[PDB]
Every structure is written in structure tokens, then in C-alpha cells.
Design a protein around this ligand. Structure first.
Ligand SMILES: COc1ccc(C(=O)N2CCCCCC2)cc1
Length: 149
């Protein structure tokens, strides 16, 4: 996998995070992110994908050591943490061919794992519209507890 870069944007209260909704195979809700171009530095990729998908430019707010990174089936995804963005910010994606909707979600209400179907004696996981975000939720909560209490 070519690495992906993006951001976890929080509001002023630190209660809420900004998610985006795509289409088709990406039809659920996730953190904004995308694939790095040849020769493009990580911070530049994160800013460009977040600006294409949200309309908001994070370049002046990125902190180099403040991010959460995960490897999932051999693709690396790194999300820079960006606190303190006002809830009344006007977000407007660039390509509406990729992004259906943009919303704020309460962190404490988001799932941190999918649910089994052991009520039905059936293997696997039940569908969840937050599937792209879920892996980052527990590591975010733990990062926030350490930096802020
Ligand atoms: C393999 O390349 C990828 C690139 C980006 C994403 C991703 O999460 N996106 C893109 C748009 C859909 C909505 C959520 C944000 C996933 C995979």
C-alpha cells in the first residue's frame, strides 16, 4: 500500500470530531485522508487531502509530533491531531464527486469496536457505518487523556 495522510480535527471543547462521508465502497463515515503523491512530504499530503475533502486548510496548525498512526492490512495511515477548530467553521468540499456530507460527532458516543452476532450463533461482525473511523477511536481517547487529562 501507498501510505495515506489526513487529520483528526477537534472543536474548542474537545468533545467533537469532524468526519466525512464518501460514496460506494467508501459509503460510511471516516477521518479525512488520502494517498501520498511521488516526492510529497507527509505534512503536505495531509493538508492537501483535508483541504480537498473539507475546504479547511490545516497547514498553519499541524504539529509534527502530534498524530496517530496505524497499519491495517499492510497500508500505513497517519492522522495529524488538530484541536481547537470552531464548531461554526464553514466546511465545503472541493470534489463533491467523492464526499457526500461533512459533520461533527460527539467522541464519547462513537463506537470503539464493531459488535459480533453471537446472539445469532453466527461468525463475524455486524455492519457499522463508522467502520473507517473505529480503529482510531481508542488510540485517540488515550492520546487525549495523556495530553489533557
Ligand atoms: C486506499 O486509499 C484511500 C484513500 C482515502 C480513503 C478515505 O478514508 N477517504 C477518502 C474519501 C472517502 C471518505 C473517507 C476519506 C480511504 C482509502
Amino acid at each position: 500500500g501507498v501510505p495515506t495522510y489526513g487529520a483528526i480535527i477537534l472543536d474548542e471543547t474537545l468533545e467533537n470530531v469532524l468526519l466525512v462521508q464518501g460514496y460506494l465502497a467508501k459509503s460510511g463515515w471516516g477521518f479525512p485522508k488520502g494517498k501520498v503523491n511521488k516526492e510529497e512530504a507527509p505534512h503536505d499530503c495531509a493538508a492537501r487531502e483535508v483541504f480537498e475533502e473539507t475546504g479547511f486548510d490545516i497547514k498553519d496548525y499541524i504539529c509534527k509530533d502530534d498524530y496517530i498512526e496505524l497499519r491495517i492490512n499492510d497500508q500505513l495511515a497517519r492522522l495529524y491531531i488538530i484541536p481547537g477548530i470552531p464548531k461554526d467553521t464553514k466546511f465545503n468540499p472541493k470534489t463533491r464527486r467523492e464526499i457526500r456530507n461533512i459533520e461533527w460527532f460527539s467522541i464519547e458516543k462513537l463506537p470503539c469496536h464493531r459488535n459480533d452476532m453471537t446472539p445469532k450463533s453466527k461468525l463475524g461482525l455486524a455492519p457499522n457505518k463508522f467502520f473507517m473511523a473505529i480503529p482510531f477511536i481508542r488510540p485517540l481517547r488515550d492520546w487525549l487523556s495523556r495530553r489533557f487529562g
